[PDB]
Short mmCIF file of C-alpha atoms and ligand atoms in Angstrom, two decimals:
data_model
loop_
_atom_site.label_atom_id
_atom_site.label_comp_id
_atom_site.label_asym_id
_atom_site.label_seq_id
_atom_site.Cartn_x
_atom_site.Cartn_y
_atom_site.Cartn_z
CA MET A 1 42.87 19.61 42.53
CA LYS A 2 40.28 17.59 44.46
CA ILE A 3 38.76 19.15 47.59
CA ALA A 4 37.16 17.35 50.54
CA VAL A 5 35.14 18.97 53.35
CA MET A 6 35.00 17.37 56.82
CA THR A 7 34.05 18.33 60.36
CA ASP A 8 33.78 17.19 63.99
CA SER A 9 30.69 15.52 65.41
CA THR A 10 29.41 18.70 67.14
CA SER A 11 28.20 20.12 63.82
CA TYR A 12 25.25 17.68 64.32
CA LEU A 13 24.50 17.27 60.63
CA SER A 14 21.71 14.87 59.63
CA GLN A 15 22.64 11.40 58.41
CA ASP A 16 20.94 12.35 55.13
CA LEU A 17 23.52 15.08 54.46
CA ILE A 18 26.44 12.99 55.72
CA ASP A 19 25.51 10.11 53.41
CA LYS A 20 24.71 12.28 50.38
CA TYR A 21 27.96 14.27 50.41
CA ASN A 22 30.16 11.54 51.96
CA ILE A 23 31.10 13.85 54.87
CA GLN A 24 33.80 12.44 57.13
CA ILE A 25 33.46 13.11 60.87
CA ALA A 26 36.02 13.24 63.68
CA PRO A 27 33.90 12.28 66.71
CA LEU A 28 33.88 13.72 70.19
CA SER A 29 32.96 11.54 73.15
CA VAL A 30 31.23 11.59 76.54
CA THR A 31 32.33 9.64 79.66
CA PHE A 32 29.87 8.92 82.46
CA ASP A 33 30.74 8.52 86.12
CA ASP A 34 30.23 4.74 85.80
CA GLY A 35 33.11 4.53 83.28
CA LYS A 36 30.81 4.04 80.28
CA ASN A 37 32.22 5.84 77.23
CA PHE A 38 30.20 6.82 74.16
CA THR A 39 31.39 8.31 70.87
CA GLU A 40 28.97 10.67 69.12
CA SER A 41 27.13 9.43 66.05
CA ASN A 42 23.60 9.39 64.70
CA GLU A 43 23.05 5.86 65.98
CA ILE A 44 23.03 7.05 69.62
CA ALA A 45 19.51 7.60 70.96
CA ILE A 46 19.55 11.15 72.34
CA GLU A 47 16.69 10.37 74.72
CA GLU A 48 18.82 7.56 76.16
CA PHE A 49 21.63 10.06 76.76
CA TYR A 50 19.40 12.49 78.63
CA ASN A 51 18.10 9.59 80.76
CA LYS A 52 21.62 8.61 81.81
CA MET A 53 22.63 12.21 82.53
CA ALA A 54 19.56 12.60 84.74
CA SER A 55 20.51 9.40 86.61
CA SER A 56 24.15 10.44 87.14
CA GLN A 57 25.28 11.62 90.55
CA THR A 58 28.18 13.42 88.81
CA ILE A 59 27.90 15.41 85.57
CA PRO A 60 29.45 13.56 82.58
CA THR A 61 32.64 14.91 81.03
CA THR A 62 33.46 15.35 77.36
CA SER A 63 36.52 14.93 75.15
CA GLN A 64 37.55 16.58 71.88
CA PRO A 65 38.78 14.36 69.03
CA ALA A 66 42.34 13.24 69.73
CA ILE A 67 44.95 14.59 67.35
CA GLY A 68 45.46 11.03 66.03
CA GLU A 69 41.79 10.78 65.09
CA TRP A 70 42.16 13.91 62.94
CA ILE A 71 45.33 12.47 61.38
CA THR A 72 43.69 9.14 60.48
CA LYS A 73 40.80 10.91 58.72
CA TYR A 74 43.21 13.20 56.82
CA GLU A 75 45.24 10.14 55.71
CA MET A 76 42.12 8.29 54.55
CA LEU A 77 40.97 11.25 52.44
CA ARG A 78 44.45 11.82 50.98
CA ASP A 79 44.65 8.14 49.98
CA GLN A 80 41.28 8.41 48.21
CA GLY A 81 42.92 11.04 45.98
CA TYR A 82 42.02 14.34 47.71
CA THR A 83 44.62 17.13 47.49
CA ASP A 84 42.97 19.64 49.86
CA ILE A 85 40.77 19.22 52.98
CA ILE A 86 38.60 22.03 54.40
CA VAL A 87 37.99 21.26 58.11
CA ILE A 88 35.13 22.97 59.98
CA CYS A 89 35.59 22.92 63.76
CA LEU A 90 33.76 23.65 66.99
CA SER A 91 34.52 27.09 68.50
CA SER A 92 38.09 27.44 69.76
CA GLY A 93 36.67 29.47 72.66
CA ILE A 94 34.98 26.37 74.16
CA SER A 95 37.03 23.37 72.95
CA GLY A 96 40.49 22.37 71.82
CA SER A 97 39.05 20.48 68.80
CA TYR A 98 40.04 23.30 66.41
CA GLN A 99 43.61 23.59 67.66
CA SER A 100 44.11 19.83 67.43
CA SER A 101 42.72 19.81 63.89
CA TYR A 102 45.15 22.64 63.01
CA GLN A 103 48.20 20.90 64.50
CA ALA A 104 47.15 17.62 62.89
CA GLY A 105 46.96 19.52 59.61
CA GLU A 106 50.55 20.73 59.98
CA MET A 107 51.69 17.16 60.70
CA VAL A 108 50.05 15.04 57.97
CA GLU A 109 52.09 14.38 54.82
CA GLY A 110 51.00 14.65 51.21
CA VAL A 111 47.79 16.69 51.55
CA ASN A 112 46.89 20.34 52.23
CA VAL A 113 44.69 21.03 55.29
CA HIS A 114 42.67 24.26 55.71
CA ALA A 115 41.30 24.27 59.29
CA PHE A 116 38.51 26.76 60.07
CA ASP A 117 37.36 27.95 63.54
CA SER A 118 33.58 28.32 63.26
CA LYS A 119 33.49 30.20 66.59
CA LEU A 120 30.14 28.43 67.20
CA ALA A 121 28.62 24.91 67.45
CA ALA A 122 25.77 22.59 66.35
CA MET A 123 24.01 23.33 63.06
CA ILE A 124 25.47 26.87 62.93
CA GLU A 125 28.87 25.17 62.75
CA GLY A 126 27.20 22.77 60.31
CA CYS A 127 26.22 25.65 58.01
CA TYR A 128 29.92 26.35 57.37
CA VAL A 129 30.27 22.73 56.20
CA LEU A 130 27.32 23.05 53.84
CA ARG A 131 28.58 26.40 52.46
CA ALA A 132 32.04 24.95 51.81
CA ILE A 133 30.60 21.92 49.96
CA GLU A 134 28.47 24.21 47.82
CA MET A 135 31.52 26.29 46.89
CA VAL A 136 33.56 23.18 46.05
CA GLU A 137 30.83 22.17 43.59
CA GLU A 138 30.93 25.63 42.01
CA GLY A 139 34.67 25.35 41.31
CA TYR A 140 36.15 27.61 44.00
CA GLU A 141 39.64 27.05 45.36
CA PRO A 142 40.46 26.56 49.06
CA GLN A 143 41.62 30.09 49.93
CA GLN A 144 38.52 31.58 48.25
CA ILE A 145 36.37 29.24 50.36
CA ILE A 146 38.18 30.24 53.56
CA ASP A 147 37.78 33.93 52.68
CA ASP A 148 34.04 33.43 52.09
CA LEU A 149 33.60 31.56 55.41
CA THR A 150 35.50 34.32 57.28
CA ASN A 151 33.13 36.90 55.85
CA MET A 152 30.16 34.69 56.73
CA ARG A 153 31.40 34.55 60.33
CA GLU A 154 31.07 38.39 60.62
CA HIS A 155 27.26 37.99 60.40
CA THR A 156 26.66 34.75 62.30
CA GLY A 157 25.74 34.25 65.95
CA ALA A 158 23.53 32.60 68.56
CA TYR A 159 21.65 33.34 71.79
CA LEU A 160 20.60 30.58 74.16
CA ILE A 161 18.92 29.74 77.48
CA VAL A 162 19.56 27.03 80.09
CA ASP A 163 17.57 25.93 83.12
CA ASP A 164 20.52 26.34 85.47
CA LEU A 165 24.10 27.53 85.15
CA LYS A 166 25.45 24.54 87.09
CA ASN A 167 26.61 22.41 84.10
CA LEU A 168 28.29 25.34 82.30
CA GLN A 169 29.97 26.47 85.53
CA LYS A 170 31.22 22.92 86.23
CA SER A 171 33.06 22.74 82.88
CA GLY A 172 34.16 26.38 82.83
CA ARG A 173 32.29 27.12 79.62
CA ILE A 174 30.34 30.19 80.91
CA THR A 175 32.38 33.45 80.85
CA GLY A 176 31.25 35.98 83.48
CA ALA A 177 27.83 35.83 85.21
CA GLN A 178 29.54 34.56 88.37
CA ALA A 179 27.04 36.46 90.52
CA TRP A 180 24.17 34.63 88.79
CA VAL A 181 25.42 31.08 89.55
CA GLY A 182 23.33 29.44 92.27
CA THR A 183 21.00 32.42 92.69
CA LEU A 184 18.74 33.15 89.72
CA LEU A 185 15.71 32.29 91.89
CA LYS A 186 12.87 32.02 89.32
CA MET A 187 14.87 34.13 86.87
CA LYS A 188 16.28 32.64 83.70
CA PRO A 189 19.60 33.56 82.07
CA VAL A 190 19.86 34.55 78.43
CA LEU A 191 23.40 33.99 77.09
CA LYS A 192 25.07 34.63 73.75
CA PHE A 193 28.17 33.74 71.77
CA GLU A 194 30.70 36.58 71.54
CA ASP A 195 33.92 36.00 69.58
CA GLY A 196 33.68 32.27 70.26
CA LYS A 197 32.86 32.39 73.99
CA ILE A 198 29.58 32.13 75.91
CA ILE A 199 28.74 35.28 77.93
CA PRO A 200 25.75 36.75 79.80
CA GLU A 201 23.29 38.93 77.91
CA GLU A 202 20.25 39.40 80.17
CA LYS A 203 18.42 37.86 83.12
CA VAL A 204 14.63 37.72 82.77
CA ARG A 205 11.77 36.86 85.12
CA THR A 206 10.48 33.63 83.51
CA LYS A 207 11.36 30.94 80.98
CA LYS A 208 8.52 32.13 78.76
CA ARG A 209 9.94 35.66 78.72
CA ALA A 210 13.42 34.19 78.13
CA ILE A 211 12.22 32.46 74.94
CA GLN A 212 10.49 35.70 73.84
CA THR A 213 13.81 37.46 74.46
CA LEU A 214 15.73 34.98 72.25
CA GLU A 215 13.42 35.84 69.36
CA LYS A 216 13.60 39.61 69.92
CA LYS A 217 17.41 39.74 70.19
CA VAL A 218 17.93 37.69 67.05
CA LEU A 219 15.24 39.37 64.93
CA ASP A 220 16.61 42.83 65.83
CA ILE A 221 20.02 41.80 64.43
CA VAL A 222 19.10 39.90 61.26
CA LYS A 223 16.69 42.56 60.01
CA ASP A 224 19.79 44.32 58.63
CA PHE A 225 21.10 41.34 56.60
CA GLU A 226 20.51 40.75 52.85
CA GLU A 227 19.95 36.99 53.44
CA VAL A 228 18.88 35.10 56.57
CA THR A 229 18.96 31.48 57.80
CA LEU A 230 17.69 30.83 61.35
CA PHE A 231 18.14 27.57 63.27
CA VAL A 232 16.25 26.55 66.38
CA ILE A 233 18.80 24.40 68.23
CA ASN A 234 16.88 22.39 70.78
CA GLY A 235 17.63 20.26 73.87
CA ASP A 236 15.52 17.76 75.76
CA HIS A 237 12.27 19.74 76.02
CA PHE A 238 10.81 19.06 72.58
CA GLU A 239 7.85 21.39 72.97
CA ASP A 240 9.96 24.45 73.88
CA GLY A 241 11.97 24.29 70.67
CA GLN A 242 8.99 23.22 68.58
CA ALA A 243 6.93 26.17 69.81
CA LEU A 244 9.73 28.65 69.05
CA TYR A 245 10.15 27.12 65.57
CA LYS A 246 6.45 27.42 64.78
CA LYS A 247 6.35 30.99 66.09
CA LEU A 248 9.32 32.03 63.97
CA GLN A 249 7.64 30.50 60.93
CA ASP A 250 4.66 32.77 61.63
CA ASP A 251 6.46 35.97 62.64
CA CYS A 252 9.11 35.87 59.92
CA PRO A 253 8.68 36.41 56.19
CA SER A 254 9.20 33.37 53.98
CA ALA A 255 12.28 35.13 52.63
CA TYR A 256 13.94 33.96 55.86
CA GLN A 257 15.02 30.32 55.88
CA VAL A 258 13.82 28.89 59.23
CA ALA A 259 14.86 25.38 60.36
CA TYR A 260 14.62 23.04 63.39
CA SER A 261 17.53 20.97 64.79
CA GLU A 262 18.64 19.27 68.01
CA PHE A 263 22.04 19.17 69.61
CA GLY A 264 23.75 15.97 70.68
CA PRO A 265 25.29 14.44 73.79
CA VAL A 266 28.48 16.50 74.03
CA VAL A 267 26.71 19.87 73.96
CA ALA A 268 23.98 18.51 76.26
CA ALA A 269 26.56 17.60 78.91
CA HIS A 270 27.67 21.25 79.09
CA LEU A 271 24.24 22.91 79.00
CA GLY A 272 22.26 20.51 81.16
CA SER A 273 18.54 19.96 80.88
CA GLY A 274 16.44 22.70 79.29
CA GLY A 275 18.98 24.08 76.84
CA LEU A 276 17.55 25.92 73.82
CA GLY A 277 19.39 28.10 71.32
CA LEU A 278 18.43 30.37 68.42
CA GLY A 279 21.24 30.76 65.90
CA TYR A 280 21.53 32.89 62.74
CA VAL A 281 23.59 33.20 59.55
CA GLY A 282 23.48 36.22 57.19
CA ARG A 283 23.43 33.82 54.21
CA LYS A 284 20.90 31.57 52.47
CA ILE A 285 22.58 28.21 53.20
CA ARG A 286 21.82 25.18 51.01
CA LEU A 287 20.14 22.69 53.35
CA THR A 288 19.61 19.83 50.85
C1 BNV B 1 22.16 25.75 71.75
C2 BNV B 1 23.56 25.17 71.50
C3 BNV B 1 24.66 26.24 71.45
C4 BNV B 1 24.70 26.82 70.03
C5 BNV B 1 26.00 25.56 71.77
C6 BNV B 1 26.30 25.48 73.29
C7 BNV B 1 27.72 24.95 73.56
C8 BNV B 1 28.04 24.72 75.05
C9 BNV B 1 29.54 24.47 75.30
C10 BNV B 1 30.04 23.20 74.60
C11 BNV B 1 31.48 22.85 74.97
C12 BNV B 1 31.96 21.54 74.33
C13 BNV B 1 33.39 21.19 74.76
C14 BNV B 1 33.91 19.93 74.07
C15 BNV B 1 35.29 19.58 74.60
O1 BNV B 1 36.32 20.07 74.04
O2 BNV B 1 35.43 18.79 75.60
#
């Protein structure tokens, strides 16, 4: 037995963790209306991506990893000697990445593939990667890891805000809230993940009250969990995510693990400018 853990690029893991654990990545891509194509990786300057999205007359579109890109990664790992591959994917409710990883896993010869639907994105998806690696080190077998991740998913979630619903409506990634699209006025939507999809939670009078609402919703849930990891998951407005991060560090006990992260180009194309999420896991995830 020799177990590998891999993921798609939307887990937005740091290059430090990718290098240290040799994590293979099946990348998603963005295509701009000028025909320029970019594959996700930590060498892309995220500020450069936001600049091009702001200068685009048409919103950029995204692409999941092709099934052949999953296959090539599975073949490379097999040929390094791995017998089993745990694959952590972007939510199946918002992308076909998971289903293509699953079908690729049925198709590749000579290695066992265990594809897992995180039902989330960004570093909350990334926490499933880090939990699986930790379990591999402790000697667990693949089905035990999958059972542990399925339990973890019962106490994991995220709420988020956006400036405008126009990018999510364009791509079809907001479920419901059709009466909010275009209106809103000065009001800001608070959204949440629910069984893998993005749905309305509440509409509040200002952005400041929307960020206060993110904190309240999440703290009301995680107070019942025996362990807690929170991630601020920030977009292009550095100060909004930084201020929420510092506030959580103050309001929460040190028994909560509180971290800061940013999402990359693919998620940014769907949220638009001003996206900001607060995600949670009822586990103490190893972040080093
Ligand atoms: C704050 C960040 C939160 C946690 C994640 C928001 C995700 C928005 C929808 C992303 C859809 C990506 C589709 C990729 C594809 O298959 O073309």
